[PDB]
Design a protein around this ligand. Structure first.
Ligand SMILES: CCCOP(=O)(O)OC[C@H]1O[C@@H](n2cnc3c(N)ncnc32)[C@H](O)[C@@H]1O
Length: 641
């Protein structure tokens, strides 16, 4: 059953049950009045008059919010906080090594953002240029992102764990003019070779657009240097003026691109504009985490993911919050690390991932030994379904049974929270994301697109726009419409399945398309398959996900070798290492299943449902449409070994 709203939260909450009901209704009945007023969470240089201007219609997918208005993201996240709060900490940085930490005030962060903005301008970067950021979890990554946004450059942040090949791919598609990186990242007492990875990427003959690499000397390690191209971060920023006046950007000027894995093909650049995105990030942050001035807030997500964009940086700083950036991992040196960070910086709001929760839960009270945790008032969960038992352990052990847990469902494409509890408004069910946010109209449809009413399950769609919605796929608006708006006409299709219960609470069950969730990472089965087939011994591959107690899903790859090739344990590790090279360690198959028995239909289609079942440990329960039905038996045998 339900968790009641505690008394401490009821007494302070920004949105109560009744305000949620009232605001939700208006957001839906009158978007223009609702978002017109809510848009004032931001400072606008010239005020908007238009609010909502959107369509999901076939051939006319067009999303626009606050369009005739102008603003600066960096002014909203920095400059406007200066007069009264310049001395308030903007970012608490906690090093992988706990002996290393910083408190960076709004004034401090502003100064460096201005210097770096000038640094970028002097290097020839202009409004609209794409800048590639390949950084570890250090404050300079934020400086780099905020400075791009200040001058209307379009940053494209590349998760540090991506391979040189994956970096090349993102740089090529985006025509990035500059790469910003560090010599090495530090994670769990170990180096990560970032700049070296950038060198390798830039040797790709198809990379033609990068003019400079800016390098942060994080570790001081010996690295290669290309004279002319490579520039030290300190060398540049020390030469730069701390004076920079922000220019008005139009609400619909592109702000960033984020490569995101899909059901088809290689990752695409999901694009966000400026006004609606930032309004939505600030609004969701404030109401869902119940942010009050003085609250120390910690989102654990990496900067290279949308959660790190919206909920580490943009949402929090637009609201004048203290946000915490942690360089390392929540269980190094010990499982208690996460709660040690909480104690050390008196974190009041913690927002993390079920993969982490499961990792700490496996260690039991080792995750909490010698720690206090009393500063916490709110907990959050993101990025993957959370099982009830994990949710209960998190609520009990980290939250001391005193903290609401906000399970926030959303996606790169949605820009901010979509279905989520509000801590003082909505009673909680372990495992449920609960109710839509203001502006969000979800529905469940069957495979044919008939809407399902009452307590039911189906494909999760959103039937109208909301300020934070992604506007396009970089350089390919037609693929944007086809990818999201063609399956169920006039609706945004998320690619998730969900059930809705008798209370109207949504329970998100995961992707219904060919998209995996591995340790919280969204990866397409097809991109793993291509990476596998690029191997000169591999003929065919079929990749499925299997349940995994820790990772949520593990990657299971059926692999057909070229005629004349035999498997080995040598080849096992080789092929795993090959995928880690093609994409990154995050996409390394957990299982390689050597076979010549892929179930192909008369047409040649791969019978993917059978492969899924077999990989999952099913041994029983159509084979008639199938060239050689005997493959199923062979597949089972091989699985049993
Ligand atoms: C939210 C930041 C991560 O965004 P990405 O675009 O990388 O992945 C979005 C997908 O993560 C899952 N997902 C995300 N949050 C939840 C969630 N809270 N519950 C269940 N599944 C979730 C859903 O399948 C979704 O389609």
């Amino acid at each position: 059953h339900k968790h009641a709203i505690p008394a401490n939260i009821a007494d302070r909450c920004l949105i109560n049950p009744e305000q949620y009901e009232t605001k939700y209704k208006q957001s839906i009945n009158d978007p223009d009045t609702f978002w017109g007023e809510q848009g004032k969470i931001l400072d606008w240089i010239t005020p908007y008059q238009k609010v909502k201007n959107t369509s999901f219609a076939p051939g006319n997918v067009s999303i626009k919010w606050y369009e005739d208005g102008t603003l600066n993201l960096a002014a909203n996240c920095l400059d406007r906080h200066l007069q009264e709060n310049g001395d308030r900490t903007a970012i608490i940085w906690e090093g992988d090594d706990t002996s290393q930490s910083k408190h960076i005030s709004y004034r401090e962060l502003h100064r460096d953002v201005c210097r770096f903005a000038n640094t970028l301008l002097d290097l020839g970067i202009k409004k609209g240029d794409v800048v590639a950021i390949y950084m570890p979890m250090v404050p300079e990554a934020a400086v780099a992102m905020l400075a791009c946004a200040r001058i209307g450059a379009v940053h494209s942040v590349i998760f540090g764990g991506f391979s040189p090949e994956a970096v090349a791919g993102r740089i090529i598609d985006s025509s990035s003019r500059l790469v910003i990186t560090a010599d090495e990242g530090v994670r769990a007492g170990r180096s990560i070779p970032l700049k070296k990875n950038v060198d390798d990427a830039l040797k790709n003959p198809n990379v033609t657009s990068v003019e400079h690499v800016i390098v942060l000397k994080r570790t001081g390690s010996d690295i290669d240097w290309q004279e002319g191209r490579d520039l030290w971060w300190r060398d540049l920023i020390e030469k730069a003026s701390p004076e920079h006046q922000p220019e008005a950007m139009n609400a619909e000027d592109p702000l960033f691109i984020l490569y995101t894995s899909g059901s088809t093909g290689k990752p695409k650049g999901v694009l966000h504009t400026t006004g609606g995105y930032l309004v939505y990030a600030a609004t969701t942050f404030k109401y869902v985490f119940d942010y009050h001035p003085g609250d120390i807030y910690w989102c654990t997500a990496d900067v290279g993911w949308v959660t790190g964009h919206s909920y580490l940086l943009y949402g929090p700083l637009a609201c004048g919050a203290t946000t915490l950036m942690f360089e390392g991992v929540p269980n190094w040196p010990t499982p208690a690390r996460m709660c040690q960070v909480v104690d050390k910086h008196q974190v009041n709001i913690l927002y993390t991932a079920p993969t982490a929760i499961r990792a700490l839960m496996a260690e039991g009270d080792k995750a909490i030994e010698g720690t206090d945790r009393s500063s916490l008032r709110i907990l959050g969960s993101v990025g993957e379904p959370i099982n009830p038992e994990a949710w209960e352990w998190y609520w009990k052990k980290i939250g001391k049974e005193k903290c609401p847990v906000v399970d926030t469902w959303w996606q790169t494409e949605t820009g901010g929270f979509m279905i989520t509890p509000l801590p003082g408004a909505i009673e909680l069910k372990a495992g449920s994301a609960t109710r839509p946010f203001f502006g969000v109209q979800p529905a469940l449809v069957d495979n044919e697109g008939h809407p399902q009413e009452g307590a039911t399950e189906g494909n999760l769609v959103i039937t109208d726009s909301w300020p934070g919605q992604a506007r396009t796929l970089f350089g390919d608006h037609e693929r944007f419409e086809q990818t999201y708006f063609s399956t169920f006409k006039n609706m945004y299709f998320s690619g998730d399945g969900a059930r809705r219960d008798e209370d109207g609470y949504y329970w998100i069950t995961g992707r219904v398309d060919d998209v995996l969730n591995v340790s919280g990472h969204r990866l397409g089965t097809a991109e793993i398959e291509s990476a596998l087939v690029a191997h000169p011994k591999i003929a065919e591959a079929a990749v499925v996900g299997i349940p995994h107690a820790i990772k949520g899903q593990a990657i299971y790859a059926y692999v057909t070798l070229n005629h004349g090739e035999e498997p080995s344990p040598e080849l096992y590790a080789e092929v795993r290492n090959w995928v880690a090279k093609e994409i990154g360690p995050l996409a390394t198959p957990d299982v390689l299943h050597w076979t010549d028995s892929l179930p192909k239909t008369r047409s040649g289609k791969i019978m993917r449902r059978i492969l899924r079942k077999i990989a999952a440990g099913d041994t029983s329960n159509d084979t008639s449409t199938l060239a050689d039905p005997g493959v199923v038996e062979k597949l089972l045998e091989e699985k049993q070994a």
